Each structure stands twice: as structure tokens, then as C-alpha cells.
């Protein structure tokens, strides 16, 4: 009983709004149905590997923080801090920003409206969700349970219908690698786009830490759950490629929306695209929930310059709203400057820079402190953490060399925190 319940959490937290929007960048970079469809498989394998390795350090440090504390505990207060600065300035705000744009993009697509009203709607949705979160967890949690229930209905309904489309079969995935989109250069632009749909697997640390006596069955739940997601993501892509194809999917910034309007001609496609807008909305809301945590955890130490104001938790709601206000504004900077794929690629390149440090950290720990209590230990010890790091190195090396400008905004904004760190370690906040 216990296991199945957790399993749900894995499936739940991983499944996002990615499948509904990312195929555009996936097949847009791959230029062939078969290359794209493998990027969805490799990303899933990369994250099962990443998941099982991170659960070890998650169990060595049972706490709801993670990477801020996984990395402080092996690399030092400085690396522990950087991840927070990165999460507060880049990762949470751009996730809010990207999904707010894609939400509004899909809003404009469904209610046929101007392609200028993307950005005003992206501001207002992010402004509205920050407000609703400052009201409390009454309304945020109301959105979340509604989002988690309804986000699975469009998928089942797309898989059944898509896999039964009349112009449908293996032939609908036949170009595997097209020479117009070279294999190795394009696969890295595709994997960085499939990974954003697997976003949220990172919280396996906080999950493993949270289990008492995990061991037998904690790895079953990480493998079983993420491979359910992986299977679901491969199935919906075959369904997409049955209706549309490589060049066609890249042709709209809303790929799943088009597939819906083919599979069900009428109001049926509306109920499916509504379901998609709920999936994206619930994303933004759920990112804010998790977002507020970081600037406050920084403010809990010296880490931020206005630590007094950042750490203020309002006695009516029990939340640090002030942290999220800085995050809201820098998301607005990002909604007005980048586009949805520019932002998804930031997020992957940046967080995967730190995610990798955490994998190496498990191996480091095995020699630093082999006698520390390990409630759970990574199975097939050297192999799988090394897999995670092999592909982890691949993504960071490729996005640098593919997107020099987008990688530099991640390198730049992370290192802007180094002057911030030595100011606030001497002055302690304000």
C-alpha cells in the first residue's frame, strides 16, 4: 500500500506540461521522428540513473532542502550557496517565466487571439499566481490537487486516439536520422528539450530523506515510477507522430494542441486543450510553492543581502512572500526578454551543472566517509552514478558549444552571486 502511494508521487511530480509543448524543440532540432523519439528515451534513462544516485545523498542528509545542503556538506558553504542563488535567480524565475509564456501562447491558440497578447497574458498569469500563493495554501493546494488529477486525462485520451489514427503505424516514425539535421549536434539540442519535461525528478532527494527505513522498495519506487513516466512520454510521442510528423510538430509552438484538433473534431479538442492549460497553470502554481522556499532558506543563513526582509514570514499565511516578490520580478524580466525554448534550455543547462556536482558527490562521499550511515545505497554502485554523470557532462558541454549566448547567461547570473556571497558573509544581511 505504502509503495503504491509513493509511486504516485513519483509519477505525479515528474509529469508536467513538457510533453504538451516541448516536441516543437525536440523534432525542430532532430528533424526526424526517430532521433527525437530516442531523446525521450535517453532523458528517461538519464533521470532514472540521476534519481537512484541522488537518493543516496538524500538519505545521508535527511532534509527538505537538498543541493543547498547536499553540496555544502561535500564542497563547502560557497557551493551550497551558489545552488541557492541559481535557484532563486535563474531556475525558479525562468520556470515561472517559460511556463507563463507557453500558457499564454496556448491561451491565444485556443481562444483565437492576437500573437502580441502572449506577453501581457504571461505577466498577468504569473502576477495572479504569485498573489494567489500569498493568500495561502488554501488556494494553491486547491489548484494542485485539481491540476494533478486533470493533467493525466489529456494524455490517456491522446494515447488511445493517437495510436488509433488512421494514417498510423511504424511508417509514421521512419526517418530516424536526417542529414539536414546532423545526429550528434542536433541530439544535444533535442535532449536538453526532452529533459525539461522530466523536470522535477530532482526531488527524489527530499523523498528519500523523508522515508524512514527506505532501502528495500525505495529503489523500486524510483525505477518503477520514472519508467512509467518514460513509457507515457514515448507513447504520447508515437501518438503525435501518428497524426503529425517531424516538420509539422516543429511548425507550431503548441504541438499537442494541433494533435487534439485532429483526434477530436469539435468541442472534444477544447476539453483536451483546456486540460493542457490546467497542466501548465498548475505547473506555474507548483513552482511558486517550491520557489518561495529557496530565498528564505538563504535568508535562514547569512546568504542574502536583505536577510531580515527575505526571512519575514507573514503571520497570517506562514510563507515568505518577500522572497517570491524578487522571484516574480526577475521572471517578468525573463518573460519580456527570452522565449519559451530559450528559457527551457537555460533551466536544463544551469540546474544540470549543479545536479552533476551532486552525483560526483555520492562517489566522493564513498571515499570521504565510508562509515557515515547510509540508509539507502545506490545499486550497481559505480556504474549508474557514472552514467548519470556521463550524460550530465554531455548536456553541459553540448549546450555551451551549441548555445554560447544562452549558456553565458547561466554562467553570468550564477557567478554574479560570488560578490553577493562575500558581501553578505561579512555584513550578515540587512
Amino acid at each position, epitope marked *: 500500500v505504502s509503495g503504491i502511494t509513493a509511486l504516485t508521487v513519483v509519477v505525479g511530480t515528474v509529469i508536467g506540461a513538457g510533453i504538451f509543448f516541448k516536441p516543437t524543440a525536440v523534432y525542430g532540432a532532430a528533424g526526424a521522428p526517430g532521433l527525437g523519439l530516442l531523446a525521450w528515451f535517453v532523458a528517461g534513462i538519464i533521470t532514472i540513473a540521476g534519481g537512484l544516485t541522488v537518493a543516496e545523498i538524500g538519505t545521508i542528509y*535527511p532534509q527538505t532542502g537538498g543541493m543547498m545542503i547536499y553540496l555544502e556538506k561535500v564542497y563547502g558553504r560557497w557551493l551550497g550557496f551558489l545552488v541557492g542563488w541559481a535557484q532563486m535567480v535563474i531556475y525558479y524565475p525562468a520556470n515561472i517565466a517559460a511556463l507563463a509564456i507557453i500558457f499564454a501562447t496556448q491561451f491565444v491558440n485556443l481562444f483565437a487571439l492576437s500573437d502580441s497578447t502572449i506577453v501581457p497574458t504571461a505577466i498577468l498569469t504569473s502576477i495572479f499566481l504569485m498573489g494567489v500563493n500569498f493568500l495561502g495554501t488554501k488556494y494553491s493546494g486547491w489548484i494542485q490537487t485539481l491540476a494533478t488529477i486533470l493533467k493525466l486525462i489529456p494524455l490517456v485520451v491522446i494515447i488511445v486516439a493517437g495510436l488509433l489514427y488512421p494514417g498510423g503505424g511504424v511508417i509514421r516514425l521512419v526517418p530516424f536520422s536526417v542529414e539536414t539535421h546532423p545526429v550528434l549536434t542536433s541530439f544535444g539540442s533535442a535532449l536538453i528539450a526532452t529533459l525539461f519535461a522530466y523536470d522535477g525528478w530532482i526531488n527524489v532527494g527530499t523523498l528519500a530523506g523523508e522515508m524512514k527505513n527506505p532501502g528495500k522498495m525505495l529503489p523500486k519506487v524510483i525505477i518503477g515510477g520514472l519508467s512509467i513516466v518514460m513509457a507515457v512520454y514515448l507513447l504520447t510521442n508515437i501518438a503525435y507522430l501518428f497524426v503529425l510528423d517531424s516538420s509539422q510538430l516543429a511548425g507550431t509552438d503548441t504541438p499537442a494542441a494541433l494533435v487534439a484538433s485532429h483526434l477530436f473534431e469539435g468541442i472534444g479538442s477544447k476539453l483536451v486543450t483546456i486540460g493542457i492549460l490546467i497542466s501548465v497553470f498548475g505547473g506555474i502554481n507548483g513552482y511558486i510553492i517550491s520557489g518561495l522556499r529557496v530565498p528564505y532558506a538563504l535568508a535562514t543563513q547569512k546568504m542574502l543581502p536583505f536577510s531580515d526582509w527575505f526571512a519575514r514570514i507573514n503571520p497570517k499565511t506562514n510563507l515568505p512572500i518577500n522572497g517570491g516578490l524578487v522571484m516574480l520580478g526577475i521572471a517578468i524580466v525573463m518573460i519580456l526578454t527570452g522565449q519559451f525554448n530559450q528559457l527551457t534550455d537555460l533551466i536544463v543547462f544551469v540546474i544540470w551543472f549543479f545536479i552533476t556536482l551532486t552525483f560526483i558527490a555520492v562517489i566522493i562521499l564513498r571515499k570521504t566517509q565510508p562509515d557515515i550511515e547510509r540508509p539507502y545505497r545506490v545499486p550497481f554502485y559505480p556504474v549508474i552514478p557514472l552514467i548519470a554523470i556521463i550524460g550530465g557532462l554531455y548536456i553541459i558541454f553540448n549546450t555551451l558549444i551549441v548555445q554560447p549566448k544562452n549558456a553565458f547567461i547561466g554562467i553570468l547570473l550564477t557567478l554574479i552571486g560570488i560578490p553577493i556571497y562575500f558581501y553578505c558573509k561579512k555584513k550578515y544581511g540587512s
Partner: nanobody, 124 residues
Framework: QVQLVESGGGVVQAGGSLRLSCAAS????????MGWFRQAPGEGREFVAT????????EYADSVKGRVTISRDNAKNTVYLQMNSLKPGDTAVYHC?????????????????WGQGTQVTVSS
């Protein structure tokens, strides 16, 4: 289902010491992580310390690290907070809090069960 009572607060001298203790309803205590939070008269909640179910992981805030220590006796279903070399800026109602799951937390909203709190006044 998880009732909490804090003990050990009161008037102390600056530089003095104080052991807060928080008794809990038992049943689930050993499978739950605990926290110490404080509330100054002019403010909301402030994170002090937290602890894993087992006690393997502990975490204290910047303003109290080194001076304070959090511990638990899962047999006695109690969590302790040994404060030393106190300062007049520790003066607050120290609340004790329980959450679901064995992972520690600096985030107050994680915690579902809260104690009524015990007054600590530090002064010269």
C-alpha cells in the same frame, strides 16, 4: 493527533544557559522530524533548529549556530534545545513543531503540529 508541550523557558542572564524540552504525544514521534521555532513580540516565526527522525541530520539558523543544540530522545518522545551563551536577542516564545516524515526542515510551513510555545527572556 500530535499534541506538544514545551518546558524549560524563563528569565535568564545574558551569557547564561537554558534547556528547552518539548514532549509529544508519542505514537508517531519516532517517525517524525521535529523543529524549534521562535517568535519575538514584534515579528512572525523564525527558524531556530530542526532534526531528523533518528537525529542523524540537524540544522540551525545563522543567528543561533554554535550557541544552541537540538537533540531528541525517541524513547521519551521529546525534543530538546540546549541554548548557551544567550543574548538579549534570543528573547522570544520558543515553539516546538512536528511535521510529517523523517526529514528535517527549516521551512515553517512544512510543520503541521505546533506547540503553544514557552517564554524565554534574556537580559542583563
Amino acid at each position: 493527533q500530535v499534541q506538544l508541550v514545551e518546558s524549560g523557558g524563563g528569565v535568564v542572564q545574558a551569557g547564561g544557559s537554558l534547556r528547552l524540552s518539548c514532549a509529544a504525544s508519542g505514537r508517531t514521534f519516532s517517525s517524525r522530524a521535529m523543529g524549534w521555532f521562535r517568535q519575538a513580540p514584534g515579528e512572525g516565526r523564525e527558524f531556530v533548529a530542526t532534526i531528523s527522525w533518528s537525529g542523524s541530520y540537524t540544522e540551525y539558523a545563522d543567528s543561533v549556530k554554535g550557541r544552541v543544540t537540538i537533540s531528541r530522545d525517541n524513547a521519551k518522545n521529546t525534543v530538546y534545545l540546549q541554548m548557551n551563551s544567550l543574548k538579549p536577542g534570543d528573547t522570544a516564545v520558543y515553539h516546538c513543531a512536528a511535521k510529517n516524515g523523517g526529514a528535517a526542515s527549516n521551512y515553517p510551513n512544512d510543520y503541521v503540529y505546533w506547540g503553544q510555545g514557552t517564554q524565554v527572556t534574556v537580559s542583563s
